[PDB]
Design a protein around this ligand. Structure first.
Ligand SMILES: [Zn+2]
Ligand SMILES: [Zn+2]
Lengths: 187, 928, 73, 186
RNA sequence: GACGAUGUUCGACGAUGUUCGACGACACA
RNA sequence: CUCCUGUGUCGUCGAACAUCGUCGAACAUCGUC
């Protein structure tokens, strides 16, 4: 706190006031030394408070700079995550079926709802009752979306593998519904 | 005798075996529905037809069939005029025979006109029966349904046969009239062509057409030069339109040669345009509707043109395959790597719309491009498996994973200390008024999809456009006192920055991450990009874990961060101006504390003369809300951007709102479904679009109540002129009459006061007018909901209060009680005591059971439960006193635990205010 | 109090206890437990809520998780 | 507030000021005693405010730690306090069916499936000994959950179906005796 | 230059009030 | 690895401003010598 011009004036005025009070002279000079001690201490408190203000400004700058060094980190992390996800889901995407149905359109613009309907190589059927199963996925192969699918790995609501022989009319109250049938587009 | 001679003359030449239905003079049929407009009366009401003498025809075996020989007895001038006008249109096949003749009735050659073989009812009768529906007075509708083999009386024997939610087979029963209505439309077009070729000018009304299609009553027709006739078909088509989708009139257009006995048309699977088909459908059924129809609403001229053409598109889109709507993907090469991204959209209402900034062969992706490419459902659906979900009837796009997710809800946590305290204070006894009714209900894995399946209540609803684009003007007048427009990214006030960011952005952080990662320039660039492109996003449904009185699951819809981020910049200025205005109709942002409830109530009651109160509800408000009314709400909200956005910017913002909130792809479970319509819970502007829809339905009920009364019996001349001009501004005027819009708005605000919050309303209406039929009653709301919302509003959920000293029976789940507060009588809102006790006893977290950590919980519950202390029922006041005593006990045992566990006092010198009613009492008094 | 409020609160606590024992990992059992709980909470007659409480408690006691002689000591 | 060093200064200043104003001196004496009280009271307000801030921060940091400890205790002792609460409030119901079921299940006679409520539904309960079988069942009727059930078949541990006339005191040690009985609600 | 008097000036402190911000909780649509 | 939008109130903490008071201390004016 001694790095200010008014701190030296404060120390000097204090020393002069002490040398005066060690003698006890007349009040005409004593009061003037008290006034000088004021001017010193007043400018001292002024510049010290200004020093506190500037130190708090520096602290605010430090926090604002420690927050940007984390906002940029988070931005880079989420950018990497997003584009990794895009480039990853794109590898199970590009094939000849998609490039075949797109090249048949008027201007390469097809609806989205027919991309999995005509290019997906795996179906998933969720079946609530047994009559729905009997009318939908009876047998090992069935027909949906103008294709021919090949049942494999039918599971239940608990994600336990159900065998094709357990799905009967009498055993249906013994297994947890719905069943999630997985199929593969037969070539 | 004389009657027998008259009968043989009425037969004439045809092999008609007639029986005298009624007698040999006028029959005076009881209350047929007419659509009249002359210098005295105007409206679509039920009048008393009295100048006909009908004879019913019987075939062999002498059993009666549905063909009548209506014989009129009009004067000579009209006789010759109708004969002259009929000798021209006679060649048309859409015209009933007429057989003019003269018969000596009393001695002197009375001239008669005998239209031949016409059905008991007309098309106006069908339209009035289906539009003004009364579940206990629908004899004409039953007779029409039975006569044409839609059903049989054993169908009406059951309960709730009319309901759309319960018994949704009435949809099939109605759709059994579709081919009849469609043949009526084709015969109307034939008649219009014959009128044009013969040079006849006249107004086509609904009440001049059988339920077969044949036309008659050429009374007000004027002859002109051949080839230059002009039919007027505004009221006809407009009054008819709401039943073109109710009865599925154009179902036969999905078949090969447009007949129901043939296979469906196997549309090309890659086809998405369907514009020539829409123009063909229009020119085939609505040929003489003389207003330009734009199949693609991107070419429209303003928002009224958008509403018009979108109405027609929502009719015509029921013919095309459902796999041809949604985003239109396209192969994009991002640095030699082929993407599949959305470069358009095909709406059921807005036609086809293409993105303007589509850049094939990119090099690198910035942050906003990564956002718009990770938010699209194109890359997520093109890469996932197919899916056939047999648990729903909603369209399922794809499964994003290899297995389905079955999400459950847990029960609540019992707070046993509060319950023991309560039962020690004498609560929860046998046969008590205050008992526990609100619990935490648990759900199993089949709850999310069973709650998503309730979107089956959203059916394609075509609206009466000539009245919808007048109701929209009156609603816009209701929303004039606000200030809206676009704001920059640095003016947006976002609260709760640590909430989820939708799908797929919730894999990487909350909304804080995406609001800190994007500079204000990135957000402004994204917003300015959504005004030239459509960004389809994915919402995420997930079950809600909260306390309620019904055991039905509750889902919430988490919309993405792109959609919310840009909708905020679009709408937030207007939304804040709505939430910061007091004294208006939409009481959003008005508090109930500090005398706010009293102010709201005193504002509703403002100046009504014979005031009654009234309140209703919308069954399945969010599932069943039609798409036309949601588009109307969006346009009314966006009407504030008259200087910041051009016309194309506003259209592309509307397209984005639709593609993101109205008909987006919903991820319920681990699979993408197609949402047919409704409202997304998590949309930015839900509580305000709901208010616009509420006011729209109320104004529609009012115009239906005023136009459907006998204008000959309105004793007041002012209201009679107002009804005349209301009809003339609906169906005879194409432009906007701002003077009459202001006049009707003033009429409503004076005789029908409203207090609208999101889908919750209270009305203080003039009871004398509502009894005479000059403003809306509850039956008018029931009818309007039946035909414009596809729900049946049961009058057991509505209420009515004739004594204003008791407030509304319920508003925002609060009851109202007039108490004395320091020489003044004020209205105070009190809750349901079961609700407060349930919030006390059952919590949703194991730490909220400790109590001493959660004293502010009980302070807030006691703030809400204070006004019960003014109730005349003693247990209601005991609720509040119980909460205060429990707060005191909690403070005591917290002090004990702090003194024992640690060793220091925690007086705090200021916690004695919560034990005493002064705090909570001052919470309900005006500030100063 | 009354024998109804006690039954509803006990059914809440009982379904909590069952959920902590990982019954949610059995579709059929969890569906039956949720049905019984939601039916006890909506019941009006005390003589049927007790039957559904019997059923739910029997779901709990058929397992081997909760040591029963120590709890009921 | 009395233990700080400024206490003596402020007290002496206030006492001298009262004693001087009670004397009726000149105007300079009033202002000088006011000056003494001024500086004393000001420095006392200073360090008293310091102490108030310190004590408020201490109380805040103590109550936060208390809340943390109690929250951790609540989250840790769950799944062991919920069960004892459940049985505490199940004993308080004092029903004749629930108590019967609890007593059987604590003796060993646990069910194997959900206890049915319909008139012709199947129930299978385990029976671990003869004396447990002796008091719950006589002849054919099987009393469980305060209701009569009619036995269909009884099996041994190895699913070897046994009859009813074979279960007796002397014939008991010839089995493994987890006999799963079956019955329907009468 | 001193004496007395008022007020102007900053800083610390106390309080009140105002407004904004962060965190927690409750209710409602 | 799940919990949305909006509104409104309460509690705790922090910041800024204004007023008053506790005050410490410079002096800008007046009267006198
Ligand atoms: Zn248009
Ligand atoms: Zn704008």
């Amino acid at each position: 706190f001694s790095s200010l011009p008014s701190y030296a004036a404060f120390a000097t005025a204090q020393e002069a006031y002490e040398q005066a009070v060690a003698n006890g002279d007349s009040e005409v000079v004593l009061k003037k030394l008290k006034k000088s001690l004021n001017v010193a201490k007043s400018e001292f408190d002024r510049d010290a408070a200004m020093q506190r203000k500037l130190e708090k400004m520096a602290d605010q700058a430090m926090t604002q700079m420690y927050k940007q060094a984390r906002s940029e980190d988070k931005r880079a992390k989420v950018t990497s995550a997003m584009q990794t996800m895009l480039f990853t889901m794109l590898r199970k995407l590009d094939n000849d079926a998609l490039n075949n149905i797109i090249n048949n359109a008027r201007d390469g613009c097809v609806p989205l709802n027919i991309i999995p309907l005509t290019t997906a190589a795996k179906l998933m059927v969720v079946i609530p009752d047994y009559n729905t199963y009997k009318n939908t996925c009876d047998g090992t192969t069935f027909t949906y979306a103008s294709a021919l699918w090949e049942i494999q790995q039918v599971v239940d609501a608990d994600s336990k593998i159900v065998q094709l022989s357990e799905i009967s009319m009498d055993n249906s109250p013994n297994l947890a519904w719905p069943l999630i049938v997985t199929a593969l587009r037969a070539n | 005798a004389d009657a027998q001679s008259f009968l043989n003359r009425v037969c004439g030449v045809s092999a008609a075996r007639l029986t005298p239905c009624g007698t040999g003079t006028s029959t005076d049929v009881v209350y047929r529905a007419f659509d009249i407009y002359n210098d005295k009366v105007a409206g679509f009401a039920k009048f008393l037809k009295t100048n006909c003498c009908r004879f019913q025809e019987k075939d062999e075996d002498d059993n009666l069939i549905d063909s009548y020989f209506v014989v009129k007895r009009h004067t000579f001038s009209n006789y010759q005029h109708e004969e002259t006008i009929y000798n021209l249109l006679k060649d048309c096949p859409a015209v009933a025979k007429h057989d003019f003749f003269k018969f000596r009735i009393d001695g002197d050659m009375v001239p008669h006109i005998s239209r031949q073989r016409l059905t008991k009812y007309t098309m106006a009768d069908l339209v009035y029966a289906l539009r003004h529906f009364d579940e206990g007075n629908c004899d004409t509708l039953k007779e029409i349904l039975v006569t044409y083999n839609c059903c049989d009386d054993d169908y009406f024997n059951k309960k709730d046969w009319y309901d759309f939610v319960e018994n949704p087979d009435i949809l099939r029963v109605y759709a059994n009239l579709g081919e009849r209505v469609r043949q009526a439309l084709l015969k109307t077009v034939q008649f219009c062509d014959a009128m044009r070729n013969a040079g006849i000018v006249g107004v086509l009304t609904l009440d001049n057409q059988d339920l077969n299609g044949n036309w008659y009553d050429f009374g007000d027709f004027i002859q002109t030069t051949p080839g230059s006739g002009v039919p007027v078909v505004d009221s006809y088509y407009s009054l008819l339109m709401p039943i073109l989708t109710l009865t599925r009139a154009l179902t036969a257009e999905s078949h090969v040669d447009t007949d129901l006995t043939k296979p469906y048309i196997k549309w090309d699977l890659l086809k998405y345009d369907f514009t020539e088909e829409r123009l063909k459908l229009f020119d085939r059924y609505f040929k003489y509707w003389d207003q330009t129809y734009h199949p693609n609403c991107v070419n429209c001229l303003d928002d009224r043109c958008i509403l018009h053409c979108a109405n027609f598109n929502v009719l015509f889109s029921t013919v095309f395959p459902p796999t041809s709507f949604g985003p239109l993907v396209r192969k994009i090469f991002v640095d030699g790597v082929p993407f599949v991204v959305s470069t358009g959209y095909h709406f059921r209402e807005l036609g086809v719309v293409h993105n303007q900034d589509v850049n094939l062969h990119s090099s690198r992706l910035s942050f906003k491009e990564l956002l718009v490419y990770a938010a699209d459902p194109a890359m997520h659906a093109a890469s996932g498996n197919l899916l056939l979900d047999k648990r729903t009837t909603c369209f399922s796009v794809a499964a994003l994973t290899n297995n389905v997710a079955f999400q459950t809800v847990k029960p609540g946590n019992f707070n046993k200390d509060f319950y023991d305290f309560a039962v020690s204070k004498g609560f929860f006894k046998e046969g008590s008024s205050v008992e526990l009714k609100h619990f935490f209900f648990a759900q199993d894995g089949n709850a999310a999809i069973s709650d998503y399946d309730y979107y089956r209540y959203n059916l394609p609803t075509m609206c009466d456009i000539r009245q919808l684009l007048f109701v929209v003007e009156v609603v816009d007048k209701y929303f004039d006192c606000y200030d809206g427009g676009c704001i920059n990214a640095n003016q947006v006030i976002v609260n709760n920055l640590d909430k989820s960011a939708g799908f797929p952005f919730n894999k990487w952080g909350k909304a804080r991450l995406y609001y800190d990662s994007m500079s204000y320039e990135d957000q402004d660039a994204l917003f300015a990009y959504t005004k030239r492109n459509v960004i389809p996003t994915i919402t995420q449904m997930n079950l809600k874990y909260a306390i309620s009185a019904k055991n039905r699951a509750r889902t919430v819809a988490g919309v993405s961060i792109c959609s919310t981020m840009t909708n905020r910049q679009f709408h937030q200025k207007l939304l804040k101006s709505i939430a910061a205005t007091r004294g208006a109709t939409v009481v959003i942002g008005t508090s109930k504390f500090y005398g706010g409830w009293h102010n709201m109530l005193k504002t509703v009651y403002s100046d009504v003369e014979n005031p009654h109160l009234m309140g209703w509800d919308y069954p399945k408000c969010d599932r069943a809300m039609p798409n036309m009314l949601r588009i109307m709400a969006s346009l009314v909200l966006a009407r504030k951007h008259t200087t910041c956005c051009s016309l194309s910017h506003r259209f592309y913002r509307l397209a984005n709102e639709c593609a993101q909130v109205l008909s987006e792809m919903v991820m319920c479970g681990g699979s993408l479904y197609v949402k047919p319509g409704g409202t997304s819970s998590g949309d930015a502007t839900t509580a305000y679009a709901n208010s616009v829809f509420n006011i729209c339905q109320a104004v529609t009920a009012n115009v239906n109540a005023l136009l459907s009364t006998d204008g000959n019996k309105i004793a007041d001349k002012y209201v009679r002129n107002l009804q005349h001009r209301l009809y003339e501004c609906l169906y005879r005027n194409r432009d906007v009459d701002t003077d009459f819009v202001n006049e009707f708005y003033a009429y409503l605000r004076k005789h029908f006061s409203m207090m609208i919050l999101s889908d919750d309303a209270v009305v203080c209406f003039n009871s004398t007018y509502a009894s005479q039929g000059l403003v809306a009653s509850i039956k008018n709301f029931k009818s309007v909901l039946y035909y414009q919302n596809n729900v049946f509003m049961s009058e057991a959920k509505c209420w009515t209060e004739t004594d204003l000293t008791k407030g509304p029976h319920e508003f925002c789940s609060q009851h109202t009680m007039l108490v004395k507060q320091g020489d003044d009588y004020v209205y105070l809102p009190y809750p349901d005591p079961s609700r407060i006790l349930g919030a006390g006893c059952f919590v949703d977290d194991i730490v909220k059971t400790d109590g001493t950590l959660m004293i502010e919980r009980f302070v807030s519950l006691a703030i809400d439960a204070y006004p019960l202390t003014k109730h005349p029922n003693q247990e209601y006041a005991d609720v509040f006193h119980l909460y205060l005593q429990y707060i005191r006990k909690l403070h005591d045992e917290l002090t004990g635990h702090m003194l024992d566990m640690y060793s220091v006092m925690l007086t705090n010198d200021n916690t004695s205010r919560y034990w005493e009613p002064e705090f909570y009492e001052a919470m309900y008094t005006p500030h100063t | 109090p009354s024998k109804m409020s006690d039954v509803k609160c006990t059914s809440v606590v009982l379904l909590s206890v069952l959920q902590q024992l990982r019954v949610e990992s059995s579709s059929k059992l969890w569906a039956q437990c949720v049905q019984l709980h939601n039916d006890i909470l909506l019941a009006k007659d005390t003589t049927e809520a007790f039957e559904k409480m019997v059923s739910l408690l029997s779901v709990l006691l058929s397992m081997q998780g909760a040591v029963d002689i120590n709890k009921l000591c």
